[PDB]
Design a binder for this molecule. Structure first.
Ligand SMILES: OC[C@H]1O[C@@H](O[C@H]2[C@H](O)[C@@H](O)[C@H](O[C@H]3[C@H](O)[C@@H](O)[C@H](O[C@H]4[C@H](O)[C@@H](O)[C@H](O)O[C@@H]4CO)O[C@@H]3CO)O[C@@H]2CO)[C@H](O)[C@@H](O)[C@@H]1O
Ligand SMILES: [Cu+2]
Length: 224
């Protein structure tokens, strides 16, 4: 249970973005049903918010998370797992991020050297999660999506035991990208409802074993 407070551009807080440039869900509840339309942008994914984060291709974005109040414990430490960041064209205001539209731009899973998950690092860094917009990105409006997946109950799948299963915490953010000479259009065209499956070893995952690797769902980070 966690959601976003605000976005920072090159270390500058843009200010409370909830229902401003973030499509904020009404609460911190997870999505579990891989068939749910809310898997992409959460329960209010389809409702436009009025503002777009102003950023340039190449900029460092920080997404700030919290649990109950800004600056708190961010997420219960039981909720180990990966954090992935995606981008899609902003097709129209009432897009909900369903369909074959996404490209992965950043990921962290499990680091065997430090036995540390992305979620451990999120907590240690007070809910600040950093990534770069590709400098080649063609200028225009995009939806950015950042997802925390918690695996504390992933040792069963939702289709078999609906009380358990992977927990997805997606957050979609509206961004208006200034170009720096790039022409690249993200083209993985990944579709969460089709591409995430209960058979996926990174979804049907037992975090309570000796493993030293975690397979992050979806394609590798988009290139060129
Ligand atoms: O399954 C084998 C494995 O189990 C390990 O124990 C797990 C439990 O399996 C799992 O159910 C449990 O889930 C907790 C979770 O850790 C909490 O963070 C969460 O807290 C919620 C709360 O339920 C909500 O009411 C509230 O609104 O939000 C908070 C989060 O902010 O509650 C769930 C339900 O129990 O996690 C356990 C690990 O901590 C064993 O440890 C292991 O030995 C077994 O092999
Ligand atoms: Cu939770």
């Amino acid at each position: 249970h966690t959601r976003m407070f605000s976005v920072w551009v090159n270390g500058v807080d843009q200010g409370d973005g909830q229902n401003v440039y973030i499509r904020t869900p009404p609460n911190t509840d997870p999505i579990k049903d891989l068939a749910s339309p809310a898997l992409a942008c959460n329960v209010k994914g389809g409702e436009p918010v009025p503002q777009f984060v102003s950023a340039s291709a190449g900029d460092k974005l920080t997404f700030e998370w919290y649990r109950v109040k800004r600056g708190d414990d961010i997420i219960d430490p039981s909720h180990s797992g990966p954090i992935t960041t995606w981008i899609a064209a902003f097709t129209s205001p009432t897009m909900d991020g369903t369909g074959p539209v996404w490209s992965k731009i950043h990921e962290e899973g499990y680091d065997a050297s430090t036995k540390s998950w992305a979620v451990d690092k999120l907590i240690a860094n007070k809910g600040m999660w950093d990534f770069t917009l590709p400098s080649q990105l063609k200028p225009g409006k995009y939806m950015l999506r950042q997802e925390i997946v918690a695996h504390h109950e992933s040792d069963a799948t939702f289709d078999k035991n609906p009380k358990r299963g992977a927990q997805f915490y997606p957050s979609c953010v509206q961004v208006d990208v200034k170009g720096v000479g790039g022409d690249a259009v993200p083209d993985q065209a990944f579709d969460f409802n089709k591409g995430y499956k209960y058979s996926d070893p990174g979804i049907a995952f037992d975090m309570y074993t000796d493993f030293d690797s975690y397979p992050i769902p979806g394609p590798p980070v988009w290139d060129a």
